[PDB]
């Protein structure tokens, strides 16, 4: 009977001393077992494993609490999905493009590249320590844990088509957006005026128009009575807003916005590019960089900087 000492963990901070029998698999001893994303469930302990840290599933009460405190989930499959993703994302390249961490194209990750690029241009603090820790490493160029977490939080596998608006929506649920406030006003000529106050995630996202200006002036929407009503922004308190719409030809003017997502293709299949406004317009497509004075393209998402807005109307 040969034994080695290893450490189990769910958070890669708190370690649990285990003595493993080298005659049985990790699976027979701990259940599903991963070594930096690699599934070692059906492998037997090698000598070179002595003193290494394995991720295991939260199989007792201490690990359930460690896992919850670090990731803010009790989804039974979360760590499996994280590990499975990490195994791929640690193989991706993360070049610095114009001082932002991007991702070299692989495994249909264009929506993640534009998400990662967007997150480095907006004021956002994550609540789950997993996201805080991984984001800090992502800003510095080691984005593999962050990208695998986005996949695990969003319940996406590597290779699956993602939507940038849906992805941002999940990440925003795990961000401190409690100070964010939006007041809308809906004028129908029959039904009269109706104010609505939105907080948190619903205060920074809108689907229907790409234009922050048009949202301030009013957009037409159908009222329950059947008339077109005008919905306009009365008050905005957020460090950013995100305007989203189905992809349409739209002209981005330098200095009028922070960054945007371009989508070419259809519902089922397509590609994202990222446009950022700096000294001029840069298009980032994974590792690729071009610039222009003006940009026209099928835009789906535009991010604007904000502090406080109050309507004059
Ligand atoms: Cl742990
Ligand atoms: Zn009405």
Say how far apart CA 126 and CA 133 lie, in whole Å: 9
Q: Are residues 19 and 68 in the same domain?
A: no
Q: Are residues 5 and 102 in the same domain?
A: no
Q: Are residues 117 and 158 in the same domain?
A: yes
| CA of 173 relative to ligand 1 center, distance in Å | 24
CATH code for the domain of 82: 1.10.8.1190
Say how far apart CA 40 and CA 56 lie, in whole Å: 10
Say how far apart CA 60 and CA 64 lie, in whole Å: 6
Say how far apart CA 134 and CA 148 lie, in whole Å: 10
φ and ψ of 288, to 5 deg: -85, 140
Q: Provide the CA 190 distance to its chain's centre, in angstroms.
A: 41
Q: Note residues around ion ligand 2 (Cβ under 5 angstroms).
A: 188, 190-191, 223, 225, 227
| CA of 287 relative to ligand 1 center, distance in Å | 35
Q: Are residues 3 and 93 in the same domain?
A: no
Domain end point (choices 180, 205, 234): 180
Q: Are residues 106 and 20 in the same domain?
A: no
| CA of 216 relative to ligand 2 center, distance in Å | 20
| CA of 17 relative to ligand 1 center, distance in Å | 11
Show the domain range for 97: 57-180
Q: Are residues 173 and 197 in the same domain?
A: no
| CA of 198 relative to ligand 2 center, distance in Å | 21
Distance (Å) of CA 267 to CA 161, 246, 263, 271: 9, 10, 10, 11
Which ligand is closest in space to the CA of residue 56?
Answer: 1
| CA of 13 relative to ligand 1 center, distance in Å | 6
Instruction: Dump strand ranges (E) for the chain.
Output: 3-9, 16-21, 33-35, 38-39, 53-56, 96-97, 100-101, 181-188, 192-199, 205-207, 219-222, 228-237, 240-253, 259-266, 269-277, 281-285, 288-292, 294-305, 308-310
| CA of 186 relative to ligand 2 center, distance in Å | 9
Q: Provide the CA 51 distance to its chain's centre, in angstroms.
A: 34
What single DSSP character describes residue 16?
E
* 68: Cβ contacts below 8 Å, ≥ 6 apart: 74
Please state, as a whole number, how many other Cβ atoms lie within 10 Å of the Cβ of residue 86.
23
Q: Provide the CA 216 distance to its chain's centre, in angstroms.
A: 27
Number of domains forming the structure of the chain: 3
Q: Are residues 188 and 309 in the same domain?
A: yes
CATH code for the domain of 301: 2.60.120.1680
Domain end point (choices 11, 29, 56): 56
Task: Write down the H helix ranges in the chain.
Answer: 26-30, 61-71, 78-89, 110-119, 129-139, 144-153, 164-173, 212-217
Q: Are residues 299 and 214 in the same domain?
A: yes
Domain end point (choices 152, 180, 208): 180
Which ligand is closest in space to the CA of residue 66?
Answer: 1
Q: Are residues 42 and 133 in the same domain?
A: no
Q: Are residues 51 and 68 in the same domain?
A: no
What single DSSP character describes residue 200?
G
Q: Are residues 198 and 281 in the same domain?
A: yes
| CA of 61 relative to ligand 1 center, distance in Å | 11
Say how far apart CA 11 and CA 66 lie, in whole Å: 7
Tokens 């298009």 identify what position? 283
Q: Are residues 175 and 187 in the same domain?
A: no
Which ligand is closest in space to the CA of residue 79?
Answer: 1
List 278's β-bridge partners, or say none.
Answer: none
């Amino acid at each position: 009977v040969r034994t080695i000492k290893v450490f189990t963990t769910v958070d890669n901070i708190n370690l649990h001393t285990q003595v493993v029998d080298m005659s049985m698999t990790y699976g027979q001893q701990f259940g599903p077992t991963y070594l930096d994303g690699a599934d070692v469930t059906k492998i037997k302990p090698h000598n070179s494993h002595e003193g290494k840290t394995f991720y295991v599933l939260p199989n007792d009460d201490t690990l359930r609490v460690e896992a919850f405190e670090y990731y803010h989930t009790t989804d039974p499959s979360f760590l499996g999905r994280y590990m499975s993703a990490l195994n791929h994302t640690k193989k991706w390249k993360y070049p610095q493009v114009n001082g932002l961490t991007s991702i070299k194209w692989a495994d249909n990750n264009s929506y993640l590249a534009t998400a990662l690029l967007t997150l480095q241009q907006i004021e956002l603090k994550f609540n789950p320590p997993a996201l805080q820790d991984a984001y800090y490493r992502a800003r510095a160029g080691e984005a593999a844990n962050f990208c695998a977490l986005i996949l695990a939080y969003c319940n996406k596998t590597v290779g699956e088509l993602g939507d940038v608006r849906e992805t941002m929506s999940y990440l925003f649920q795990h961000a401190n957006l409690d100070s964010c406030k939006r007041v809308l006003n809906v004028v129908c000529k029959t039904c009269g005026q109706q104010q609505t106050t939105l907080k948190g995630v619903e205060a920074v996202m809108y689907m229907g128009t790409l234009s922050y200006e048009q949202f301030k002036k009013g957009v037409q929407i159908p009222c329950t009575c059947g008339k077109q009503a005008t919905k306009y922004l009365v008050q905005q308190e957020s460090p950013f807003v995100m305007m989203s719409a189905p992809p349409a030809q739209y002209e981005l003017k330098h200095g009028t916005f922070t960054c945007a997502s371009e989508y070419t293709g259809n519902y089922q299949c397509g590609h994202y590019k990222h446009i950022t406004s700096k000294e001029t317009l840069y298009c980032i497509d994974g590792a690729l960089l071009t610039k222009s004075s003006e940009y026209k393209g099928p835009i789906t998402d535009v991010f604007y900087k904000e502090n406080s807005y109050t309507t004059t109307i």
